[PDB]
């Protein structure tokens, strides 16, 4: 819910710099002379930056040597039809690149197989200034590598079509992460109204990063493999590690945890990694079901939890929820709900992004202002 | 093991521990080049079906090059 607390940045500027360098007068000639021998080379541009240069398709070597010495030989009539297919190949990829860059306007956020084939991407990963661990990670998750890599069309001149494929680096690797799920916590008083609700707004991802915590509220930035959590720190907040305390002791003096106050008596279901949280309030139906044994639980009013072991379904109202069937040990930390610490007439009825300290300060203000009369 | 999860009934929140990381820190750029030649005004009959197909492909190639030049 903190999604609007992020700063803005540029996603492709690191490639636009290389393009502005490639637009120099004697730039493309250097790259062409370098690739005149092999398909890939290391090229020191005129700005000191060393880049990898891959020649994925050589049509001049095909046109001026095999096709045009047939069309322009003499007597245009070709004997065999094999030339038509040989030219449909080696040109389908250029046509597809043109068709892609026409509708995407220079930058395609997933690098397609036509921009960079899988074998070419694997070779590029193998020949990168990265460690063996990062090489293996990218080789095993080429799909996620494509998800976070742009392809900026750069230049076409001097018989050379150029585009810079800007890839993710994955500097932080194998530092343990954890996902924080949240659900509204409301009192279960018998009244139809005057029911208070507290929620945690720090939901998302958390990762160890240089002694601090990289926290991702926007779940789009993080893809998830079996146990690997790929993320993008361009849309990440940087917190002290003590924010993790907000899991074990929310009233700690170190980190002021972020919460949310509301007065909404609506039930909800939050599917977690290896289970499901159910905030069942009012007359809403809440049923944990199984594929074999029909129904296995009916949730009492409050915020409860079930593990994905044996549970195949959580249904709240008319809303169905298929639980994630991944193995893992769940634990139920028993403890009194926090919402039972405050009073209805003093609890702030409306504060979107609040905290323990801010809610306590508003409580102080209201209590003092009422008692001074 | 390697994936454990806790549910904190106190705050009505769950935490999924046991996940490793791969955080995008910066970027790496590499130049991918396609070398193209020119089919400069080849003149030849379009009566035969095979040569007509060849011309249908030559026009596609030339238009692709020109359109790449245009989109800039």
């Amino acid at each position, epitope marked *: 819910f903190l999604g609007f607390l992020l700063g803005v940045g540029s996603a492709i500027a690191s490639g636009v710099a290389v393009c502005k360098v490639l637009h120099l*007068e*004697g730039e493309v*000639n250097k790259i062409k002379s370098a690739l005149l021998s092999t398909n890939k080379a290391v090229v020191s541009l005129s700005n000191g930056v060393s880049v990898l240069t891959f020649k994925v398709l050589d049509l001049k070597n095909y046109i*001026d040597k095999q096709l045009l010495p047939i069309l*322009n030989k003499q007597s245009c009539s070709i004997s065999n039809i094999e030339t038509v297919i040989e030219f449909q190949q080696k040109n389908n990829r250029l046509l597809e690149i043109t068709r892609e860059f026409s509708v995407n306007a220079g930058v395609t956020t997933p690098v397609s197989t036509y921009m960079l084939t899988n074998s070419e991407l694997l070779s590029l990963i193998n020949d990168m200034p990265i460690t063996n661990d990062q090489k293996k990670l990218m080789s095993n998750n080429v799909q996620i590598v494509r998800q976070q890599s742009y392809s900026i069309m750069c230049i*076409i*001149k*001097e*018989e050379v079509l150029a585009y810079v494929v800007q890839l993710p680096l994955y500097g932080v690797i194998d530092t343990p992460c954890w996902k924080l799920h949240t659900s509204p916590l409301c009192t279960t008083n018998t009244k139809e109204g005057s029911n208070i609700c507290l929620t945690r707004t720090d939901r998302g991802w958390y990762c160890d990063n240089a002694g601090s915590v990289s926290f991702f509220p926007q779940a789009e930035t993080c893809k998830v493999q079996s146990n690997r959590v790929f993320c993008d720190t361009m849309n990440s907040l940087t917190l002290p590690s003590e924010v993790n305390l907000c899991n074990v002791d929310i009233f700690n003096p170190k980190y002021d945890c972020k919460i949310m106050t509301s007065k909404t008596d609506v039930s909800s279901s939050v599917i977690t990694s290896l289970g499901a949280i159910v905030s069942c309030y009012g007359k809403t139906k809440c049923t944990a079901s199984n594929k074999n044994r029909g129904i296995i639980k009916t949730f009492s009013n409050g915020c409860d939890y079930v593990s994905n072991k044996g549970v195949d379904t959580v249904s709240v109202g008319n809303t169905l929820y298929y639980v994630n069937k991944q193995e893992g040990k769940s634990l139920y930390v028993k403890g009194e709900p926090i919402i039972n610490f405050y009073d209805p007439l003093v609890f702030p009825s409306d504060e979107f992004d609040a905290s323990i300290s801010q809610v306590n300060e508003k409580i102080n203000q209201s209590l003092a202002f009422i008692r001074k009369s | 093991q390697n994936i454990t999860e806790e549910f904190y009934q106190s705050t009505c929140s769950a935490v999924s521990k046991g996940y490793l990381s791969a955080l995008r820190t910066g970027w790496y750029t590499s130049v991918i080049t396609i070398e*193209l*030649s*020119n089919i*400069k*005004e080849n003149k030849c009959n379009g009566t035969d079906a095979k040569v007509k197909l060849i011309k249908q492909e030559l026009d596609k190639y*030339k238009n692709a*090059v*020109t359109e790449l*030049q*245009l989109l800039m």
Partner: antibody
Amino acid sequence: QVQLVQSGAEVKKPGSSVKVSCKTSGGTYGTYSINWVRQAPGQGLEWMGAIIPIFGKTNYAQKFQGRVTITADASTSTAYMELGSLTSEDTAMYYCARVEDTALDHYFDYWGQGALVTVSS
Amino acid sequence: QSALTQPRSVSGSPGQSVTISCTGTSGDVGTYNYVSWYQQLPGKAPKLMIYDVTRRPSGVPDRFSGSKSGNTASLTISGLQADDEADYYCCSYAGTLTWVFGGGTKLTVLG
């Protein structure tokens, strides 16, 4: 078949300007660039400038910088050029040549018959 | 950005090979293998016979053979004929929409 017509010859006075047009009859809508080259009576041509009519992009030689402005009308597929502040040293046979594709070709393939600009008193 | 240096004149009797040199700076030639030679019959716009470092267009005799080595080009004509009478003009790509021209060689056969 594919060719380009060229304006007629004319005469000006030192200090005036001459505007020479160059219309093409080929088309193809490609990224062709029109190049201006006024030789002399004296031996040797001299490359002046260039313009890609599809973009309006121009680039002039350092010998005539700030003196010539090359233009091109895209509706009629015609490329003009205007050389102001003429001198008798700028008397030549102003030709007009193109290159097929700016990114694929780096040599002139077709020319025009050209005009003749004499500027005396 | 000055013009190129060509020999003012060469000549050869029929049945002889003549080579015309074209020298330029590091920017014009030596860097770009984009050279072009043009002939001009006085009274008409030029018409090229070499459209790359060593490539000739459609309708050019095999005796025409070009080359290039370190800021110096070489246009070679084999078996001279009474038809190859014109002013040859060496040209070279120099950058984005910038070409440099040679001083022109004047080839008129002796025979």
